[PDB]
Design a protein around this ligand. Structure first.
Ligand SMILES: Cc1cc2nc3c(=O)[nH]c(=O)nc-3n(C[C@H](O)[C@H](O)[C@H](O)COP(=O)(O)OP(=O)(O)OC[C@H]3O[C@@H](n4cnc5c(N)ncnc54)[C@H](O)[C@@H]3O)c2cc1C
Ligand code: HEC
Ligand code: HEC
Ligand code: HEC
Ligand code: HEC
Ligand SMILES: O=C(O)/C=C/C(=O)O
Ligand code: NA
Length: 568
């Protein structure tokens, strides 16, 4: 057969997958997927039949309930969503190579036809607030608005939830939490403010950072009340003390927090629609929003009538064309991001009259795995790893800010470097076992052997770690002034990961005030329109601190849903 449907119909009726009238249930294909699961079992149950030692298409790090049709289309060949970041050895029936080419909001102007018909019709729904994007900001807004008495619809343009937020692995910053106190850490919202402003080269909007620092503990409290584990507290670059919260043992914070938010949304019966792209904010004759035009992948264009629209669409770091026009030094770099993170939400915001700010400020993650092409968290350095070049030497304070660390690595021989650590660092952060499982962390029982394996001067590497361990025990790094020296690298085997910077986060975006209201260039509020999360500009200035994005998206997402409900 040439497609999955043709296969099944050899022995099955159309109504084995379809509804009686044969119309598709909705853009989430809820009915249809339910049919796949009635015959094949849950994703979990299927996974039992497709195990590989180090990977499984049906049991991945993605949170929520991933629909079969995310990867298996019926009447045409389809793509494995995992192939957008990885190249595992898969044999999916009726597969085609991964290719993403989603038309821009401006290209969608060619559907004048269909769009006019949709706006001429009745609104398909009339609700209080529509939230665009199912990452951390969007789920937070949806839940908090629902808790304040609003009726909400949450839309996601991708087949899966979570955006980039499901990928976060270092932690969520907050001060001064019960969690920190339990770990004997002393901190304060003021100190977090100070670190953040200084880290952003004082380009940050001080009113927005004051919201970020002052609300941070309550956001950790809010998430924990919903069931999250944020009790591990680690160090990230540019911070005066440990304040990056994450699940016990140093597991990834992203997947976890998104799963908690998803469970809480399902608990509240929130209307979540997948494969549903927000296209155009609609305004009444006085300029306040009145609804939003959306495009369903399977049911087409329709609009929703609502008093408020909350844009929670994420950044544009996957769009290297737009990145390179703003910062040419990042042209051609690999990105850490999900395939959808291309900035179409910003375009929707601008078309509604929102201004943009700080767009030229774009952050590279210093340590993308060269071998795996995926992000390696800053927590690996925060928990004790060092960086060495091919010469086998240290060359940078490994917990300085991301802009300086990226430049340092790029300046080394071959424009890459190596994370070096031992089993004491490995056991302190369980996320590291995930890198080892990916195959990107070669290991050996001695640095001379490791160096020969990886093309690092083995003798110089050995002396480099002995010297580093001596500064650790003597409590001061006189070589690169690293201010926190948590562990000696001296237990068990030794690991190396080859790393180079990758495009990661866009600090600029839609201009918002402290109530998450979107503003135009005249600094006037657009009534009804809100922005929260990486789509916004002004929170992080010229350089974002690791851990501060997850913090931002919960605080501003929650704030925005509450303001939108009150606006109503
Ligand atoms: C690999 C990785 C690791 C990171 N780790 C950390 C960490 O440890 N700590 C930290 O603080 N930060 C971390 N960051 C940054 C942080 O995860 C992101 O900034 C965060 O994802 C921003 O969340 P958000 O809700 O704003 O957007 P996202 O989580 O990206 O969600 C936005 C959603 O909107 C959808 N969308 C976009 N346009 C439309 C549209 N027109 N219609 C409908 N849906 C739309 C997108 O597809 C996406 O699902 C990490 C980022 C990455 C990529
Ligand atoms: C389940 C294994 C399927 C079988 C068997 C058939 N269809 Fe299907 N169809 C199914 C889904 C998951 C979808 C979504 C798109 C995709 O290819 O994955 C579809 C869609 C159609 C459509 C499009 C509806 C629209 O665009 O509004 C039609 C016209 C359709 N399918 C027809 C149809 C007929 C007549 C079938 C029996 C011969 C049949 N389908 C089987 C999944 C499955
Ligand atoms: C039961 C009535 C089924 C429905 C509804 C769907 N599938 Fe199915 N599928 C079914 C059988 C009996 C078989 C053969 C293997 C077996 O279980 O005995 C299959 C096969 C497939 C395959 C393999 C195709 C190939 O070329 O080998 C896949 C990938 C599969 N089915 C996927 C799938 C999806 C995603 C469904 C919903 C859209 C779905 N199936 C519906 C039984 C049934
Ligand atoms: C992408 C993330 C996928 C989603 C979600 C689902 N499937 Fe899948 N499926 C995918 C791949 C890459 C493969 C190949 C596995 C490999 O290791 O090479 C599969 C395979 C199938 C098959 C074949 C299993 C067999 O009998 O050999 C089945 C029957 C199957 N998929 C079913 C299925 C169902 C019903 C899903 C929803 C619950 C589903 N898959 C999700 C990729 C992805
Ligand atoms: C890019 C945005 C990603 C997509 C799409 C998928 N994965 Fe992923 N994967 C991602 C990262 C950044 C990492 C590094 C380790 C971490 O936890 O952050 C990984 C790692 C894996 C691994 C190794 C560790 C493990 O969980 O076993 C596997 C086996 C893996 N990813 C599988 C996987 C599958 C099956 C996916 C599709 C459903 C998938 N990943 C998509 C980033 C990205
Ligand atoms: O784990 C990291 O590298 C990511 C942290 C950040 O992007 O905030
Ligand atoms: Na931004």
């Amino acid at each position: 057969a040439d497609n999955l449907a043709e296969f099944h119909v050899q022995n099955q009726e159309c109504d084995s997958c379809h509804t009686p009238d044969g119309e598709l249930s909705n853009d989430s294909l809820t009915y249809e997927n339910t049919q796949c699961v009635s015959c094949h079992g849950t994703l979990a149950e299927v996974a039992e039949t497709t195990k590989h030692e180090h990977y499984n298409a049906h049991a991945s790090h993605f949170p929520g309930e991933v629909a079969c049709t995310s990867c298996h289309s019926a009447h045409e060949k389809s793509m494995v969503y995992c192939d957008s970041c990885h190249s595992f050895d898969f044999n999916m029936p009726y597969a085609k190579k991964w290719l993403r080419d989603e038309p821009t909001i401006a290209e969608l102007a060619k559907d004048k036809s269909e769009r006019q018909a949709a706006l001429a019709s009745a609104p398909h729904d009339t609700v209080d607030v529509v939230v665009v994007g199912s990452g951390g900001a969007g789920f937070s807004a949806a839940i908090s608005a629902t808790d304040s008495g609003a009726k909400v619809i949450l839309i996601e343009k991708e087949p899966v939830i979570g955006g980039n937020a499901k990928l976060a692995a270092g932690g969520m910053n907050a001060a001064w939490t019960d969690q920190q106190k339990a770990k004997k850490i002393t901190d304060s919202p003021e100190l977090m403010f100070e670190d953040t402003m200084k880290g952003g080269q004082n380009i940050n909007d001080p009113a927005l950072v004051k919201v970020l620092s002052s609300h941070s503990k309550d956001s950790v409290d809010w998430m924990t009340a919903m069931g999250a584990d944020l009790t591990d507290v680690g160090m990230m670059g540019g911070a005066s003390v440990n304040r990056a919260h994450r699940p016990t043992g140093g597991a990834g914070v992203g997947a976890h927090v998104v799963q908690v938010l998803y469970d809480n949304a399902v608990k509240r019966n929130i209307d979540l629609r997948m494969n549903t792209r927000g296209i155009e904010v609609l305004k009444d004759d006085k300029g306040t929003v009145k609804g939003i035009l959306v495009k369903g992948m399977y049911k087409g264009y329709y609009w929703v009538k609502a008093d408020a629209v909350i844009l929670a669409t994420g950044g544009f770091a996957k769009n290297n064309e737009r990145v390179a026009k703003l910062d040419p030094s990042l042209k051609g770099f690999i990105s850490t991001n999900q395939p959808g993170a291309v900035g179409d939400g910003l375009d929707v915001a601008e078309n509604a009259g929102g201004a943009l700010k700080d767009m030229q400020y774009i952050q590279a993650a210093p340590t993308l795995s060269v071998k795996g092409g995926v992000m390696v968290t800053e927590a690996v350095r925060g928990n004790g790893a060092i960086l060495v070049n091919r010469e086998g030497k240290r060359f940078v304070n490994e917990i300085t800010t991301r802009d300086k660390a990226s430049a340092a690595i790029l300046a080394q021989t071959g424009k890459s470097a190596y994370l070096i650590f031992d089993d004491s660092v490995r056991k302190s952060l369980s996320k590291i076992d995930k890198y080892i499982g990916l195959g990107v962390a070669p290991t050996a029982d001695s640095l001379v052997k490791l160096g020969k394996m990886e093309g690092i001067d083995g003798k110089a590497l050995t002396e480099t770690v002995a010297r580093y361990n001596s500064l650790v025990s003597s409590g001061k790094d006189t070589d690169f002034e690293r201010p926190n020296l948590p562990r000696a690298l001296n237990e068990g085997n030794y690991y190396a990961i080859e790393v180079t910077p990758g495009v990661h986060h866009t600090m600029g975006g839609v201009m918002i005030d402290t109530k998450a209201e979107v503003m135009n260039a005249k600094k006037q509020v657009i009534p009804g329109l809100y922005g929260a999360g990486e789509v916004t500009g002004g929170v992080h200035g010229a350089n974002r601190l690791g851990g501060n994005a997850i913090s931002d998206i919960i605080t501003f997402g929650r704030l925005a849903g509450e303001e939108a409900a009150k606006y109503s």
